[PDB]
Amino acid sequence: IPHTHAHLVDAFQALGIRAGQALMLHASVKAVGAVMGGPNVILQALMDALTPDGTLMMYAGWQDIPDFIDSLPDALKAVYLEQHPPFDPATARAVRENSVLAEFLRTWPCVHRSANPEASMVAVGRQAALLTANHALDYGYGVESPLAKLVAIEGYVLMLGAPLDTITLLHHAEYLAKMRHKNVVRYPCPILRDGRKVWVTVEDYDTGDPHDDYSFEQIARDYVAQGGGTRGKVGDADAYLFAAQDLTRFAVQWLESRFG
Amino acid sequence: IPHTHAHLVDAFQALGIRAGQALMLHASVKAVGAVMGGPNVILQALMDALTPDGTLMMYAGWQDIPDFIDSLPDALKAVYLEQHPPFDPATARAVRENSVLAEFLRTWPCVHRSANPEASMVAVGRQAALLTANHALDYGYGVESPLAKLVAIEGYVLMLGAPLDTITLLHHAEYLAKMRHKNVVRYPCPILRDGRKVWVTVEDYDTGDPHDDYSFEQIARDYVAQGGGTRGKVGDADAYLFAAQDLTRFAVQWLESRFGD
Amino acid sequence: IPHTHAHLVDAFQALGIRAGQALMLHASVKAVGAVMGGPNVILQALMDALTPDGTLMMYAGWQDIPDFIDSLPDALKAVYLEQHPPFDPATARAVRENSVLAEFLRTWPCVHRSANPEASMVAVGRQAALLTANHALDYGYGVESPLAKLVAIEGYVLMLGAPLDTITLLHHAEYLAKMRHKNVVRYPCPILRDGRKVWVTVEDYDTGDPHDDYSFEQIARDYVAQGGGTRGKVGDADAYLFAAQDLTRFAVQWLESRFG
Amino acid sequence: IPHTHAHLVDAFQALGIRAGQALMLHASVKAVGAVMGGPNVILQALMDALTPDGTLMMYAGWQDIPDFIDSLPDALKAVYLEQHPPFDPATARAVRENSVLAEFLRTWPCVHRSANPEASMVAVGRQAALLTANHALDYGYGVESPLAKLVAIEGYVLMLGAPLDTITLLHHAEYLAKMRHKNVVRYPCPILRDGRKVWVTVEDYDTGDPHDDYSFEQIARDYVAQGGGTRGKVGDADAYLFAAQDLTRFAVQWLESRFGD
Ligand SMILES: CC(C)(COP(=O)(O)OP(=O)(O)OC[C@H]1O[C@@H](n2cnc3c(N)ncnc32)[C@H](O)[C@@H]1OP(=O)(O)O)[C@@H](O)C(=O)NCCC(=O)NCCS
Ligand SMILES: CC(C)(COP(=O)(O)OP(=O)(O)OC[C@H]1O[C@@H](n2cnc3c(N)ncnc32)[C@H](O)[C@@H]1OP(=O)(O)O)[C@@H](O)C(=O)NCCC(=O)NCCS
Ligand SMILES: CC(C)(COP(=O)(O)OP(=O)(O)OC[C@H]1O[C@@H](n2cnc3c(N)ncnc32)[C@H](O)[C@@H]1OP(=O)(O)O)[C@@H](O)C(=O)NCCC(=O)NCCS
Ligand SMILES: CC(C)(COP(=O)(O)OP(=O)(O)OC[C@H]1O[C@@H](n2cnc3c(N)ncnc32)[C@H](O)[C@@H]1OP(=O)(O)O)[C@@H](O)C(=O)NCCC(=O)NCCS
Ligand SMILES: CN[C@@H]1[C@@H](O)[C@@H](O[C@@H]2[C@@H](O)[C@H](O[C@H]3OC(CN)=CC[C@H]3N)[C@@H](N)C[C@H]2N)OC[C@]1(C)O
Ligand SMILES: CN[C@@H]1[C@@H](O)[C@@H](O[C@@H]2[C@@H](O)[C@H](O[C@H]3OC(CN)=CC[C@H]3N)[C@@H](N)C[C@H]2N)OC[C@]1(C)O
Ligand SMILES: CN[C@@H]1[C@@H](O)[C@@H](O[C@@H]2[C@@H](O)[C@H](O[C@H]3OC(CN)=CC[C@H]3N)[C@@H](N)C[C@H]2N)OC[C@]1(C)O
Ligand SMILES: CN[C@@H]1[C@@H](O)[C@@H](O[C@@H]2[C@@H](O)[C@H](O[C@H]3OC(CN)=CC[C@H]3N)[C@@H](N)C[C@H]2N)OC[C@]1(C)O
Questions:
Q1: What distance, in Å, lies between the first and last C-alpha atoms of chain A?
Q2: Residues A79, A47: contact at Cβ < 8 Å?
Q3: D189 to chain A nearest CA, in Å?
Q4: C72 touches B: beta carbon within 8 Å
Q5: What is the C-alpha separation between D20 and D51, in angstroms, rounded?
Q6: Which of A206, C245, D84, D229 is 20 to 30 Å from the Cα of C137, by its Cα?
Q7: How many domains would you assign to chain A?
Q8: A102 C-alpha to ligand 1 centroid (Å)
């Protein structure tokens, strides 16, 4: 029997999902196992557990962001500058490695999408506009970001068979933490401005690799080991539910004590 | 006979105010009628309907802003430059014509205040810091303003016996709208910088008079006439509740269709 | 006798015109009086005093710009939108009020014309391409204008019997000056884009009326009174030669001290 | 015994320096040897050979540009962002490796200085304003730069005892040349905007190291070998005089023949 909508709603509630929460999801469709109706039902079941008074958010980003063009031969870079489409929030596809579920939520009715191409988040529910509003282009995991707002409203992160190393929220802890040295990246990206394509430079902390000798999986496992979060099964998947505020506080302290 | 806290909470909920909303208030104490406990109870009842996870904001401005000193004679202007106090967000009083309720909210526990003196907004609640953060000095009703943020987070405007012409949000619609004519003003203002008084010049669109042949009352009356918002009584006052995003969109289209490209 | 080429050259040199200068001209043919060979000889004599290493520029604009159509009834506005020709820099005639000399210079061999229709400038000589390049559509008397470049390369303005109120350079001073009140206008204009007519909206400061209680005649006469420029006769005309940088600096200070 | 103004003027003229030319100088004071009156007289003799109808330019840059702060510990970077002064063109000192002569010219009467901090050029003479005008912040050795204008007005470059590897003009050839790959740098810099310090990001091609397996010394030596320029002694210094237009054309073809795609 493929997992049903009802069995998923009930499992989310059993794990601790409650009406009105703001929740960021990381998931693996394959870890959940076959669902009756496909991955839509994972999203709908989670939405139903949250009710319309709650909010569901995922990290979408942009699968085709051409942030790498300075490494290309100059003549090819020039073609990119002429021919590559800009980030259009209506069409820019989600990063495939963020789960097909992120692309499914990005194209969900009543979705809101944040404006930072590389860090773009999508949300559905009562606080979806709030979470995705005024997402600054520079330092997209920092103070002017959906992650800051998720912490401020005491939201949650649900890991649904997704590896612990993929928690995007810990990039916000990296932004906050006073560390010996953090790597800054400056990269090009085409956006829409007054309906026309414009290439801009985006400045951010590196989010492709850690700033020092740590991993997100290590921080998350240490968090679990000292009693943080709840754990349970949802479909076939091992699931973890974390409070965003407590996990961010823990991770900032973890980073500053080891690398400050 | 005076309106009670409970009856005000019920009236706000009947109008459509819900837990967690971000709400900007324009109000007349006299229009509401006598409240048991005074105007504090209007603010508290509204906060209670919003809950601490909602947010209540008002336009405070600065009652004593000396933005007029350029039209004084040189000798008097010199006295102002020397003697007028700077905008101190801890003490600068709210504009009296913004209702005593704005000054009451400005002095409420856990209030946050935006840094633009002339355009200063005050808020209490979960998004109060968010709404009031990084309020740019120039174009204070524009893209870096609490009004832009109220629109972005899909907040609301509540008119509680206040004239429709007083909706500050429509200055943000003026900022957004592409119009054949705009008046740009530069005016002086004393502020605090590194703990010291410094006189600066602020640039903004004129918000004292319209940029063309319209009024805010007209726009708002037209919005209501085509079904915008909800209406209901709160105390003795006729109240209107508007979605900030829908009203701004309507007002921008209204201005652009009449004066636009 | 009509004035000769040789006597005009001598008069220009006596006034202070030197080889290699970049010069913007405002002129009245009638004030100069009849010239042997007509107004062509005024331009050629000036070009000869400047030599090919100098540059001569004038304000052309567009005599037929339909910037007034938004105020017409819909039915007439519609006809303008469909039937009025776009700004074609090869054919768009200079504003007649700018002197026939501006249209004569616009049609001179080796002329360069700037792309802003309402603010269009025409130039012949060594820096003609430099002065007329990349003239932005918005704020056409501003930072991206031939007037800004004339100031930046320390060019000159020659008034050849033209009223001081007609100095276009003082609109650049208005743009630069920090003033208590500015009128900003948006108006329609047909242009060519990829060889097709397209209607665009242009944003600019109002240049039809001052922004406050002043006139250009007032500013320039004050400049002359404090020793600015040199004066002399050219033909029958009273002529004034101003340094573009010094006049702009003076006018900005004049505006800011009174309205800033 | 020390070299005199008159002998320096003649030595410059012997190379081909003429009245009215626009000339960019690279120099070593030590290579020239002691001059009667010091390095001022080198500049004045060159100016006198060029006459007031000519123009003299040097690369000043900014000795204290804090373009390296991202490599510092975060806490030290934070101090720089707060405390390091911005580029003020009235005071920012010339890079010392560009010769004390560049700082001497930067402080010369009637000097003009271009606005790009890292690439800042200083010039005195008839076309000094033109050469230094509207120097773009990004790609400061490219199309909107003093080097582009020096090429356009058919100016010259004089190497006065300076190593051929230090010719700034060849960074403009690097900018122009269609090469297989050029390294792009983006770096921070504090500037003045409306009288206040602002930190901005500057984008440019790398000018600290070549983009491929070449050196400027090698290009210039090849230019000389095929008959380009003139050479002679000025004081104790070996001098080279290059036409900017011909050298830029030669260098672009040189780079594209060897490293193009
Ligand atoms: C990388 C990772 C997503 C891979 O997980 P996964 O289960 O293999 O991949 P997805 O969740 O995208 O599911 C894909 C499956 O959905 C299924 N599916 C069901 N209906 C589908 C449909 N209409 N269209 C496409 N796929 C569909 C398919 O079986 C597909 O697998 P297939 O192409 O092999 O046939 C996962 O291990 C992970 O890391 N999750 C966390 C990711 C994250 O949040 N990163 C944030 C960056 S900070
Ligand atoms: C102008 C306007 C405020 C007048 O409304 P109002 O009801 O007369 O005035 P207020 O709301 O300030 O209420 C004043 C009353 O509060 C009462 N009050 C109760 N307790 C009070 C107290 N401790 N202290 C002071 N006043 C008190 C008083 O009776 C006072 O009236 P009084 O001084 O005549 O005795 C109203 O018509 C209006 O325009 N509101 C919208 C304004 C706005 O929001 N503008 C935004 C700018 S875009
Ligand atoms: C308005 C102003 C141009 C009128 O000056 P003017 O001397 O009367 O007019 P012009 O310079 O255009 O000269 C016109 C004369 O050129 C003569 N002329 C000679 N050859 C001519 C020819 N081939 N074709 C046409 N006219 C010719 C004609 O006699 C003509 O006069 P007419 O039409 O009455 O017979 C002048 O007073 C002025 O203000 N100049 C400054 C304008 C300016 O620079 N504005 C900038 C905008 S900010
Ligand atoms: C690096 C380089 C400048 C060093 O040359 P240099 O002759 O040693 O140095 P300078 O030209 O700065 O001259 C310094 C000498 O000027 C002399 N001098 C005379 N008057 C002086 C004065 N008032 N103040 C300071 N120094 C003075 C001093 O002897 C000083 O040397 P010292 O400090 O050892 O006593 C030279 O080899 C070079 O590379 N020139 C090319 C520069 C260039 O254009 N770079 C741009 C790269 S694109
Ligand atoms: C398209 N260009 C890319 C650019 O979008 C950006 O992507 C980041 C991505 O790698 C991060 O995932 C890595 O890190 C984590 C935790 N250590 C585990 C999985 C790893 N893959 C992700 N959490 C956040 C993304 N912003 O940085 C890298 C890049 C190559 O430049
Ligand atoms: C202290 N100096 C003043 C300065 O603060 C500013 O005040 C503005 C105020 O008038 C506006 O209220 C007018 O607008 C209409 C709506 N059309 C409703 C009532 C009208 N009075 C208000 N909505 C916004 C304020 N920023 O401009 C004017 C000024 C005199 O300079
Ligand atoms: C075609 N439509 C017109 C549009 O081109 C623009 O014309 C301007 C023109 O009037 C200005 O001349 C006035 O200014 C004073 C200087 N105080 C001298 C003479 C006055 N006539 C001129 N200097 C600059 C022009 N850009 O504005 C007005 C307009 C009607 O909209
Ligand atoms: C302050 N930071 C520095 C920044 O100003 C910039 O300096 C450049 C400078 O090195 C170049 O000189 C090198 O190259 C040449 C020919 N290959 C020979 C001498 C070499 N030293 C000079 N020609 C142009 C300068 N723009 O780049 C490097 C930097 C460290 O980032």
A1: 51
A2: no
A3: 14
A4: no
A5: 6
A6: C245
A7: 1
A8: 9
What does the alpha-carbon distance between residue D172 and residue C178 come to, in Å, rounded to a whole number?
37
Query: In the β-sheet with D22-27, what is the strand arrangement from edge to edge?
Result: D112-113, D121-125, D55-59, D22-27, D156-160, D237-243, D230-234
Pair of tokens at residue B48: 């209670």
Give the range of the structural domain holding residue A226, as residue numbers without chain letter.
5-63+90-181+212-259
**Shortest CA gap B186–chain C (Å):** 5
Ligand whose nearest atom lies closest to the CA of B204? 6
Atom 19 (ligand 6) nearest CA:
B166
Q: Measured from the CB, is residue C30 less than 6 Å from ligand 3?
A: yes
Breaks in chain A after residues, C-to-N cutoff 2.5 Å = none
Q: Tell me if chain A has a CB within 8 Å of the CB of D78.
A: no
Could you count the other beta carbons within 10 Å of the beta carbon of residue C197?
A: 15
Please report, as a single letter, which amino acid is at residue A28.
S
Distance A209 CA to ligand 5 centre (A): 7
Element housing B14 (H / E): helix B5-15
Label residues C224-258 b or e (16+ Cβ within 10 Å = b).
Answer: eeeebbeeeebbebebbbbbbbebbebbbebbeee
List the determination method.
X-ray
Alpha-carbon distance of C135 to C118, in angstroms, equals 11
Q: What is the dihedral of CA C170, C172, C178, C184, to 10 degrees?
A: 100
Closest alpha carbon to D131 in D112, D105, D107: D112
Specify the 3-state DSSP secondary structure of B196: strand
Q: Please tell me what resolution, in angstroms, this structure has.
A: 1.6
Token pair for D162 = 């300076």
Is position A231 within any domain? Answer: yes
Long-range contact pairs involving A250-254 (C-beta distance under 8 Å, separation at least 24): A250/A219, A250/A223, A250/A226, A251/A170, A251/A173, A251/A177, A251/A219, A251/A223, A252/A173, A252/A176, A252/A177, A254/A173, A254/A219, A254/A222, A254/A223
Is D46 in contact with D25 (CB distance < 8 Å)?
yes
Q: How far apart are CA D183 and CA B114, in angstroms?
A: 44
Instruction: Find out whether A220 and A241 touch, Cβ atoms under 8 Å.
Output: no
**Phi, psi (degrees; rounded to nearest 5) at D198:** -135, 135
The number of CA neighbours under 13 Å toward the Cβ of A185 is: 18
Distance in angstroms (rounded) separating the CA atoms of residues B98 and B126: 23
CB contact under 8 Å between C153 and D129, yes or no, is yes
Return the number of other C-beta atoms located less than 10 Å from residue B77's C-beta: 16
In a domain, B239, yes or no: yes
**Residues of chain D with a following break (C to N over 2.5 Å):** none
Residues on chain D touching C149 (C-beta within 8 angstroms): 133-134
Kind and range of the H or E element at D191?
A: strand D184-193
Give Rg (Cα) of chain D: 19
B145 Cβ closer than 6 Å to some ligand 6 atom: no
The answer to whether D174 is a known ligand-binding residue is no
CA C257 – CA C244 distance, rounded (Å): 20
For ligand 2, atom 29: residue with the closest CA: B30
List strands edge to edge, sheet with C230-234. C112-113, C121-125, C55-59, C22-27, C156-160, C237-243, C230-234
What gap in Å lies between CA B42 and CA B49, rounded to an integer?
11
Q: Does residue C26 sit within a domain?
A: yes
Under 8 Å between Cβ of D84 and D131: no
Q: Is residue D23 part of a domain?
A: yes
Q: How far apart are CA D60 and CA D135, in angstroms?
A: 13
For residue D204, give Cα distances in angstroms to B174, D138, D140. 39, 6, 7
Residue C241 backbone dihedrals phi, psi, to 5 degrees? -120, 120
